[PDB]
Amino acid sequence: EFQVLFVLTILTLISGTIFYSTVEGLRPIDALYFSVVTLTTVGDGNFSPQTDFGKIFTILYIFIGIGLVFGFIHKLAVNVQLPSILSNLVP
Amino acid sequence: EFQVLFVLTILTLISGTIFYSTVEGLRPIDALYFSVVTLTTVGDGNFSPQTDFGKIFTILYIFIGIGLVFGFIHKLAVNVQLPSILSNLVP
Amino acid sequence: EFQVLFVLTILTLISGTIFYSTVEGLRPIDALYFSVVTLTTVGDGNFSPQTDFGKIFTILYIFIGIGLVFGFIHKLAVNVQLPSILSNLVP
Amino acid sequence: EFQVLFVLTILTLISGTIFYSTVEGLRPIDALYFSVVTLTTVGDGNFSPQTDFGKIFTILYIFIGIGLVFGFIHKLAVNVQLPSILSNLVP
Ligand SMILES: [K+]
Ligand SMILES: [K+]
Numbered sequence: 588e589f590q591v592l593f594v595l596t597i598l599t600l601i602s603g604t605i606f607y608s609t610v611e612g613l614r615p616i617d618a619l620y621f622s623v624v625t626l627t628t629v630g631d632g633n634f635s636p637q638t639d640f641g642k643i644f645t646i647l648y649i650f651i652g653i654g655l656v657f658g659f660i661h662k663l664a665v666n667v668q669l670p671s672i673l674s675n676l677v678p
Numbered sequence: 679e680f681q682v683l684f685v686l687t688i689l690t691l692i693s694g695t696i697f698y699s700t701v702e703g704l705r706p707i708d709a710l711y712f713s714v715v716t717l718t719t720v721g722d723g724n725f726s727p728q729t730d731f732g733k734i735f736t737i738l739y740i741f742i743g744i745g746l747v748f749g750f751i752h753k754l755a756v757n758v759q760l761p762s763i764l765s766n767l768v769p
Numbered sequence: 770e771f772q773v774l775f776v777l778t779i780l781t782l783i784s785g786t787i788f789y790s791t792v793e794g795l796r797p798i799d800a801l802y803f804s805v806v807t808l809t810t811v812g813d814g815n816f817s818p819q820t821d822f823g824k825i826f827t828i829l830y831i832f833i834g835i836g837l838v839f840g841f842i843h844k845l846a847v848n849v850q851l852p853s854i855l856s857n858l859v860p
Numbered sequence: 861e862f863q864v865l866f867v868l869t870i871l872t873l874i875s876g877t878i879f880y881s882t883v884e885g886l887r888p889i890d891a892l893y894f895s896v897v898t899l900t901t902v903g904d905g906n907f908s909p910q911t912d913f914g915k916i917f918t919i920l921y922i923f924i925g926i927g928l929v930f931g932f933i934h935k936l937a938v939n940v941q942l943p944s945i946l947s948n949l950v951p
């Protein structure tokens with residue numbers, strides 16, 4: 588479950604990285620950063636897509652990627668972080 | 679259920695598109711982009727409504743649209759994306 | 770329930786409006802806008818508190834106000850918007 | 861439960877404060893502010909990490925810290941704010 592969500596999240600982020608570096612001309616690390624803050628809904632305070640293609644893609648990317656990204660975060664904290672802490676709270 | 683949430687989300691986004699292009703003078707695609715990043719809570723790092731009418735509308739728009747948009751995303755991932763993946767995980 | 774959450778949300782937003790217009794010098798409508806986009810986690814793409822007092826207050830404001838604001842939005846969509854739609858879907 | 865989430869949230873915020881003030885050169889209060897708005901997903905409208913180290917760290921920080929921060933907010937409102945209000949609604 589966690590493994591599949593991990594892989595799915597990775598593939599989604601790879602797609603955004605390729606898209607923004609190609610269409611919006613961002614350096615790969617910047618494209619990845621933008622993809623991450625966008626899908627986690629944090630948002631970037633400096634960059635907004637400048638092309639209409641980038642704006643349309645971002646709209647679709649958000650609706651399709653948000654659910655998955657948060658599902659991964661949800662399990663990452665409940666089935667991976669909680670135990671390491673919950674069991675670690677046992678005297 | 680998903681169909682109704684889809685239509686409801688579309689109508690809400692259309693309202694924002696019309697509002698921002700008219701009152702804030704944004705190009706339709708920019709008004710739509712702003713409506714989407716606002717209701718999904720991602721936020722836009724460059725534009726903020728400049729008119730008091732735009733600020734008041736955005737406040738109301740956020741409170742009324744956020745629940746619906748996320749309800750749609752919630753079902754889009756649970757009743758449309760999960761299956762295509764869950765069933766696809768069957769050897 | 771909805772009435773109490775409504776009043777509680779109003780009081781919280783009033784506090785932010787007074788704080789930002791006084792300490793950060795924002796026009797009341799701008800202070801209210803900033804309080805709303807901050808507590809709904811949308812964020813503002815132009816303004817960030819400039820004083821240390823404003824930064825500390827915003828940090829505390831976020832942790833204390835986010836839960837309430839979303840609890841209100843949660844009920845506003847489930848116990849006020851859903852019915853008007855759910856019952857409206859009855860032929 | 862609430863105490864542990866409180867401590868865990870504090871430690872996470874301390875880590876971000878140290879990281880951003882050291883690598884991104886922010887004043888401690890600004891590093892803390894950025895860490896808070898980033899993990900609560902509000903986002904900052906002015907600052908984005910400028911170094912590649914800062915961008916990579918922020919990406920990892922977001923995925924690891926978001927779940928915890930919201931778990932704390934979740935309990936802070938349900939097991940600390942609700943009662944003080946729920947019991948306060950008793951004539
Ligand atoms: K900005
Ligand atoms: K700017």
Ligand SMILES: [K+]
Nearest residue numbers: 628719810901
């Ligand atoms: K957000």
Ligand SMILES: [K+]
Nearest residue numbers: 630721812903
């Ligand atoms: K933002």
Ligand SMILES: [K+]
Nearest residue numbers: 629720811902
């Ligand atoms: K945001």
Ligand SMILES: [K+]
Nearest residue numbers: 632723814905
């Ligand atoms: K922003």
